[PDB]
Amino acid sequence: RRRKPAVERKISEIREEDTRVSLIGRVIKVDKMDYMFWLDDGTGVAIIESESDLPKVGQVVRVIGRIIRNEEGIHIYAEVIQDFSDADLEALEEIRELERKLLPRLEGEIVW
């Protein structure tokens, strides 16, 4: 069984069937006793559980991690954290819409 690929989604549009999630956004503040922090995307706030590295307040970063579903709520096990504050986001969102509105039909044509 090959590893499943990451899927980029937003907090307000997180789906139930997903397992691995890449999330881009700003951290608002961090609790260090738990190695955890609160990440804001522009549409919601999520709990991100750091393992060894802790971010700083006010930088736009991208985190790939695993989701865990329980009675407690939605807490995200971070795996890899990367800096993005020195980057663009408008073109990223634009290509996201274009990518989503083009993929469904691309493989539809061309039989075999």
Partner: protein
């Protein structure tokens, strides 16, 4: 004495392509994706998800790359392990190398790897999208030309009249042949 250029792909197109293994010694292995694109050397931009695994005797070194569309095992053999010494888990990378097979899974025999800014990741997205759509429409145009006659001198002449490159005809022929 020529070297064919590297083509930019989504990883998923690499995983379920059709691998043609060379027979003679004067032609290389290659890959034919679903939409009839001839790929020799791949070039991808993406993240690394796991710590590199290199043997103690620097014989072989392999790790993983994910573009958000699949998982690919990037390998480097013998004296290529130096490349695998340039990567630490948790950084964007740009990779270029050949394509080969093992245990029914696509693997990239590494030839170069580098660290790169996100803006180039966006550039990779745009470039691969435009190239894919271009090849889709060109192949769609060539489809009926192949279907109506196949590989005939008149078919080649008329395909040249529409300005369709010669290769696509035999690419489609080999794809149809491997259909059976």
């Amino acid at each position: 004495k020529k070297r064919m250029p590297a083509t930019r792909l989504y990883i998923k197109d690499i995983l379920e392509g059709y691998f043609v293994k060379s027979e003679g010694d004067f032609e290389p292995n290659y890959l034919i994706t679903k939409y009839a694109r001839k790929v020799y050397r791949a070039k991808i931009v993406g993240t690394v998800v796991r710590e590199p695994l290199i043997a103690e005797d620097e014989t072989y070194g392999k790790f993983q790359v994910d573009d958000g569309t699949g998982v690919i095992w990037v390998l480097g053999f013998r004296d290529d392990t130096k490349f695998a010494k340039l990567v630490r888990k948790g950084d964007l990378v740009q990779v270029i190398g050949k394509i080969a097979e093992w245990r029914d899974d696509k693997q990239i025999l590494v030839e170069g790897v580098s660290k790169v800014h996100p803006n180039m990741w966006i550039l990779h997205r745009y470039e691969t999208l435009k190239e894919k759509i271009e090849h889709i429409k060109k192949a769609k145009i060539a489809l009926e030309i192949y279907n109506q006659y196949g590989i005939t001198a008149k078919s080649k002449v008329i395909a040249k009249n529409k300005g369709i490159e010669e290769e696509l005809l035999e690419v489609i022929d080999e794809l149809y042949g491997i259909m059976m």
